[model samples]
Target: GAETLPAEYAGGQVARGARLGMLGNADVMDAPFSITSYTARTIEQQQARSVADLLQANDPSVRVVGGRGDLVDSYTIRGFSVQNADVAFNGLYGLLPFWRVPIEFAERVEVLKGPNALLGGISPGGSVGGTINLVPKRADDQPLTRVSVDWTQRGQLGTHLDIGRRFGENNAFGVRFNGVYRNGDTAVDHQSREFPMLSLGLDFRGERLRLSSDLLYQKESLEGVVRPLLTGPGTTHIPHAPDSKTRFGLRDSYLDQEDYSMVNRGEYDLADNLTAFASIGGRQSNYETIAANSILVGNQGDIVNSLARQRGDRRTYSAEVGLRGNFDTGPLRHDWTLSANRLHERLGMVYAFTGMQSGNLYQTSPHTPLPDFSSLDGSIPKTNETDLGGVALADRLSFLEDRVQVTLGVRRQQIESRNYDQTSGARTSHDKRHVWTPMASVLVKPLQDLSLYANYIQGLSQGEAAPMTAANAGQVLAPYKAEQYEIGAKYDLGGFTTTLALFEIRKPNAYTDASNVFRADGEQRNRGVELSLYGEPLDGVRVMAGATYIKPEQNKTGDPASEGKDAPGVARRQANLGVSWDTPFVDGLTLDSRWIYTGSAYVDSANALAVPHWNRVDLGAAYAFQVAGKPLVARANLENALGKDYWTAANGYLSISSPRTLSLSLTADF
Candidate 1:
């Protein structure tokens, strides 16, 4: 029974596939959508600090932005924003930290491309770039303890410990624990970061029942964090990127965050073919930041800086219950699921800002002190509250000896939100709205090694509320809806797999119109194609390669000057290629290389200012050997091997690429 559980890794690679939300786990070849499941081995090998690091290095379609030295983990997927809070943990929502997720406790990092409202329900942040799901570590039959220590450029040091144990008859009870700590200066001058994380996982397996729970705590702090540069409205030419290692913000600027969470899940078999499942989780977080925003005031690198200080506390609670079963009706077979989920969040915040300060981008002073807030005597107060609920039903029908499959599902979702005046403690506004979203997918297997699939889905986001400055102040707009259509094909040889997909997504854009009415009067559309290849094409040689071409445009805008222009910060082309080879001359030794490229992107809606395209290379090697009869492994990696300096992203804000970095680590099991 223990052996039937999923293995920690397969052939030193990540899992062959991943869970498909309420649909259950599916192999890559059989899944109708594009998904990647990166294994723990991959995480350890790359020395990834967080989800942002892992995705930026491995996935071509993902772009990491914001907080190069801060605690925020922001990203853009398919040219749409994916907030950190939107990421799921163990298939359940609102379980992980809202700002940044720690990778130390994750067993697998799963990426599902494209919107999946029907599969995973609507995210709190209304992300349409797909979903990021993290699978927590579970103990296997083998007892293990591993320790690792590593260092980054500029004196940062890290240590990690992983321990697991399984006990009891049939090895039905298991526990896994992970801990991590890192601190010190980073590659950027005058910048420093500190983070600590701890997690515990417990599970029980029985003939007819399975249960699991996880608890985690994480804290992070950053000083002298780098801030993104913004081009002023009158600037005609975008300035060249500064030195990669330069720090623009004052040394006194800082961000601090602490988070704690607990989650529990269970499954019970009710009959021969039916099972029931339930999940519940909660999270609490406290965050504070004193940061700077830089705006280019002149073409020659003159800048104006605005400083702000804010503190907030956030709470989240989520729950889900579902039933899954398989049945047959005449000549057709059916796999179905019925589920309901709910999420609630509340926030309290206090904030203040300082007037603009003059500065220069090319040469900056770091002696500026944070604005004194004692004079304002601000106090935290209830700021926002959100509630979301949904019920869904899905069924997959199979025919022709299970070679042909079709799935149809729909979700009835509701969103309720409220805002409050911090100082007055009075209700400012409230919005309640509901909508129905439907999904359809089809799969056909023409041969044993080929599969063709297509799907149509929709995404949901919170509605906009009229600001106090608008003519229709305190008015709430209806929730926004985004639609998507995708079709793709996959082929699997014995050792290699390839997939190609073409898709288009359209979503409503909301802005204050000329009449001062806040409304959804514009449209943003993204059309793209993707090709992915992975697996061992030849003995001892493994590859993961992919490319995406996206054309994102703003249409029917409120401003004619912005009409039909390319959406700012969206690149037309992105590509990634990774290769690994097992050296025949040395057993247990491997070498790898990676290449990443991103095309140019416009910095403003007018398309007059642009950031140039950039590419980077990474190389790594690993060797395993036995020391005193214990398994030991050593690894080294070099990112941006050519020491390239360039703009990394320009979507909503400007981001500069990291300078060359080298990482090394050694792990031993006892």
Candidate 2:
């Protein structure tokens, strides 16, 4: 049982359980699902600039519709689509940065919600509503030198440098470094932003081997960016929510991104309850986009402009290996795991487009101007190749003393793919398959601070849709998994803890006919309810509330006129409330506040457009004094305090929301 990490639970801003993948780290009352991990002091007292501003200010089942001058980081859990290339960095999947992941060497930002394919596997954008890992940052038992500076509001400015070190023998050898710089102009209109980052963390704590490494390099720039708004396939109306700083794209739209990553992980202890693990990672990316698009012809906001230019490159390689153990037999106990993993990606792209003019999204007008190619290039032989892998096994069974437990697993996953032909690069489409996926869980603790859990999981969505009661009806059905059912309950209260989850996922699809056959009977059925709470029940108060209530739906749509509807951009309700206060009348003061809400979604699936439901309010404060004696902190955030404008759809697009802003920071410690 080496590979330890997960211990912050009582207002230290969350932890105590996360990463249940391959059955590693499980504590939250013996975890059976539903997790949240967020720390790094909650991203420096909530001045969070990304990870979608700390999961939209404290997760209500996460939904960060990314698109306000996008640089990529899209998310929408519990209702699918969680890809910015499906984030995960320590648990390995393509090792971060496909489009944007800057948390300055993050130290935990976990979140494992639903559809875990037998503990994290199969997902390269077949994302079934969950999984987000990224934990990186080590070297701790002391020694950390930090310096930070920041300001934002019309003109961004930033600097950060953090360093850590541990020495010889008992300190075991470690080092860390994180550096970032931010640059200018961004309060919307005509946009502008830049961030350059570098991170390096290394570790080795041997007594039986344990090593870690994470290295990253990032460069991002966005100038005049804005995209996400398109609807006019007979535009069913939805436009009247503009002006948060209104203005659209292409004042020469731009984005340039570069990323490099490296990850290494190891643990070996193999006897003393056994353990052995491995990880490998690689990532290299290049992103370029010059975009300006808008389609939504008049419901008052009138628009039609379009233009696009793209260049992409990505190469990823990932690997994992594992074994974990604990055993006993006459008293009944066991906890075992075995795993295997792989991910391979390679893609290259090229594109350019322009045509369609006229615009007017609330007065900002511009038209005509699209010419001048900027030399595009893409490689990896010019297209795509994907290879994913898996093999897993698990066990957990404990009786009585451990307060009843059970777990079972299986995962066989595999998916090979190919696609090319960007001008005859040949190979135009091929997919290989494999599947097995299965999982079961149950945990119960009568009292001693309550816990109850239940689960049934399966996930793997790609191809497979044939079921007009099958006769190979309309063919196509080689793989399928998607299924989930959950139940949860947790109560600690020693320092505030409360959780309640209930879900049902279902993913499958296909539809056609009264006698014309071809039907997989359809499915989309989401169903959910999650209620969360975190730490510090009172003394100085620190809470992170939650609420999510989904209903996803969309069953049997062989044209029963969109049968049961509402599956396009699902968002039944999303809520969050955050609080922090530590001030018995100043002495390092502290006060924080947040309230986020989102409800109302349907940008189609026959629900006739509909997109309007948004909420915001945030405030922050921090002052941790000790200045000359080293240790300092002074933060202030005030995001969207009362300047709001609508629209925030999910996987069906529509962004715009995030306006009133102010953030200031200064941190020092040596």
Candidate 3:
């Protein structure tokens, strides 16, 4: 057998563990890093409409940074940003969509907290804080067919289909398919979204050889989208947040995006004690946007509108091969892992911006659509490309009946990228470099129900030096390294599990010196503590709660104004609490709710323009019972129950929170 996916925990809201990148799957108590794996049941019960929805509502350390209706769900992990374009599919990168990822076919959304170069390699978009992996659905031994009819606020309606079967001798052949069709206006009151999403997964189980394949496609069209609001010059004070229902963007703004991806993976048992595996995947994605950039807000809430149109095309290919085995020497048990991986991505784009128009958002009318501009090029032109590869080796040694373990690992990474002028098709810049990343971790189980772990890891990023005025102009620096030290403890309290971790990260910064030479001399330090707990606390009650406190400061910078200041766009405190209870009064009825909080943070290096803290609550309910001869589930969820208006998150640019959203769905198993 190719090893079935991880089993869900007691509450069915999460799994015991998840895939640890190059090391593959590992149990939580044995892993040296912190992770959370949300199960499919949680996704459906919460009526999560996007990847950001699930993460923002459940994880205290994660915040959705993308603008509402932007069709992008970027997030910040810990105190660093992770672009949606950088998320991984399964354990491989470059396979998911570059703009928006569809989750209807995902079985689990796993979040690995902290930089993990030795285990996960480098990310495409250079996320330094953490990594996210989406596991695809797989067929079970039992035959299954499920369908769902869904409705949401405004006039949105949708249907989802899931079918799975196992065939051949020993039930070795399996096929699982998921298809979705959703359309109509969203809760925003202006935008209309529609998508045709489908995924097919096939697998084969053999005595010594196992194979699996996946194909996915999603097409999305959004009309009347709203962009984030930006503060204009001479703005002395941040404007008060408008009502969530108010729309400030032009009604003509829109986006159309599509992605197609395929992956094939297989495993061969070299011996009774050793196994080898290989995986390959690729994705092609394209998207076009109009009037979706931003509307500048002046000091008094007056808005300056400008139509910003853009288009993007991308093709990414990724592959990985690895071996796993375990052996013992004398009184020591050793687990060894070795792997190599590579990824290549090509990007293309087009852009245009129209003149500005003045208006007041509070009393604005539905702006008119712009006439077709002859000068705006609709064809996407090749703009940039990146090539990345790495080789990793690690070994875990256990002693004293496997109660204590120590792990050491290292990875050699190679990175290269080139940028081209959009119009001329000529190379504008070329950067090629390599670096060595190292890691060391330890795990100790002093008691059967408790685990203590600590690890040191690093992350990589493309670095550049020398501006036009520098003595070493046009000079390119080698890849920069970010380091992390984390220590944590996990306690399994029967039905509930709790984790506590304290971490510190040092990220380097660059600037030109007084000598007119550029150097990576500055640094930013972030220290934090996290407490996470999830599982069934009582027979019929489940709880998920967590809190994170971060203190980030910059130092060694050449600029006096920015030195010793807090890092930009970082919230000092974040917390989340969610609970679900099966009513004792009604056999098939359950109720759930969540509370999310984020403290104020600065948007600039100078510590100016602070984004105020925000709070939100969500309510949900579900009833499961038998209807005729089939199992039926009726669910409803209301997000932002308090209708709070605030900035969800910011990346130097403010992003308004979404309006109150209501979702209702009925599903049947046949």
Candidate 4:
């Protein structure tokens, strides 16, 4: 049950003051950045199984739109779509499956907004809006083991295991492992999917040193199924079927994807006030899909005419070393850091399919040869890319008898990208640019348990790779640069914590014209406000809620006429409300419920259709008891308590969201 205090939270802070204090102390935050932190408990109470699930349910400033399968799962933060930004484990960079993140393996999730070019090279797709950092669950102070099994409606079965052990005097050495497997058929008639994850780590801690490493692997498979849409807005798509079973189009489509990574990280205290950290990691993934086109049908949605497919593989390697320390000079205290990093990535893909399979009229079965896509025949062989980059920097500052703090930082970055095509074995490379970035921020602690801050940050992303054909061989686009201005205040009043912030970002180059379908252009702007509150508001009761108001628009022109509309898939208002209560009458029983809402949003630049608004409620309860002196917890989750049917931000081509579900689980710790 929720009442059982899991070993995961043992070293985490429970009070908002300590939480805010940690943020204040971190050197990274001193460098003019907007970062948000969410604890494992927050994610657990919200029932997030994947990174997408977590962001959608809890982050009002980010939008996650589901499509065809986990691979098609798309995300947008601020106003920009982070199509496939790399995921990091303990600051090690690499990409993972959209739905691969294991909630149980993470101690916390930290989102840093704006450019982090000083830490990592700029993203190729210009995903400078933000980056998500996953902090892995570390070995516990005490040895523990936990196992859980879940059975949900619709033929779903899931199992998970977690173990942690401490050894040696003073428990200086420890190890931990976590794994999960879930397989299920959807209640949505013909849809079905499976999800699995495995994670392991080891750690050693001493009065002056600490070392750790983690490995993660995940796989997923999904059957292709098109959801029925309501004729109008705000209507249910449930067809009236006595058997509660219905199929869309045909049964010959599916999506398959696999992802895995190994990450190693270590931190050592070189002195009482100096620490050094280093991380090395690598990731590899493959994704393939063959599905009927969900859109682009001339007429008769009944016919399965056209097909589309894409296969892509990506690999990345990264390493970094950094130093962190604090010192006192005169009457002021100083915190500082110096770091250097190197990263390399390779991405290759082939997109191919038979175009608009016309001439089929209500045929019982459309017969067409599966294009030899794997051979790259008639395929638009996407450029195979290899990128290498490195960054070196230093950040430092101090002020106001430790009541106020200021930080200034500068970094030098060098990067290069090369593109290739296997069909013709043609290759091309972009000129490397040496760029310098600066950062600064200030914070004031005028009252106990309260802090106010303002920040200015800069970020960057590489420009799109325009196919350099005979006509445009020497023509190249420029990389995009973004700047963000943020101001916020945080307050901790013993029982509860609250934070509010206002932010604005400017992107000098956002895709403006559809002429070059692949190239992005001129100016873009994103502005918003965010507010959050969490923890106990009163005895026996806990609450967590937050909201975001976003306004994104382009300042360019093109053929579509609607070229300067709001960026596709960004919603203006997003919010979440959750509450839990433990009955004082019961020793180990608790009840929890949560409600999440997302405001209406555009589907495309044309703004012809809005994805419509959505809200859902989840209800759960848990009971904890002891058997053979071992703690055992059992729980039941009734998601979509009201069976709400809703969709989030939409893409021009597809739209998808989770359906109502119910799952029950039990866990035991020894």
Each model's lDDT:
0.84, 0.80, 0.85, 0.63
Q: How do the residues 142-229 of candidate 1 rate in per-residue lDDT, one tens digit apiece?
A: 8989998988888889999999999999999999999989888888778888989999999999999999999999998987767778
Error of 4 at 533 (Å): 1.6
For model 3, give the 10-residue run with minimal summed lDDT.
357-366
Q: What TM-score number comes out for model 4?
A: 0.85
Best by lDDT: 3
Where in model 3 is the C-alpha error above 4 Å? 1-3, 295-297, 363-365, 369-373, 376-379, 464-476, 511-519
As for lDDT, the candidate ahead, 1 or 4, is 1
lDDT of 4 by residue, 147-231 (tens): 8888867887888888888898988888888888889886655668787888887777777666777787887787744432222
RMSD of 1: 1.9
Query: Any idea how many clashes model 3 has?
Result: 0
Residue 63 of candidate 1: its Cα lDDT?
82
TM-score of each: 0.97, 0.34, 0.96, 0.85
For each of the candidates, the C-alpha root-mean-square deviation to the true structure, in angstroms, is: 1.9, 23.5, 2.0, 5.6
Which runs of model 4 end up more than 4 angstroms from their true locations?
1-34, 43-47, 67-69, 95-99, 119-121, 225-250, 296-306, 355-383, 428-431, 467-475, 510-521, 558-560
What would the per-residue lDDT of candidate 3 be over residues 200-319, giving only the tens digit for each residue? 999998988999999999988988776677766655566777886776777677888999999999999999889999999989998888774445566667887777777888889999
Model 1, stretches more than 4 Å misplaced?
Answer: 1-11, 375-379
In angstroms, the error of model 4 at 479 is: 0.8
Q: Alpha carbon lDDT of residue 519, candidate 1?
A: 86
Better of 2 and 4 by lDDT: 2
TM-score, candidate 1, is: 0.97
User: What lDDT does model 1 reach?
Assistant: 0.84
Q: TM-score of model 3 relative to the true fold?
A: 0.96
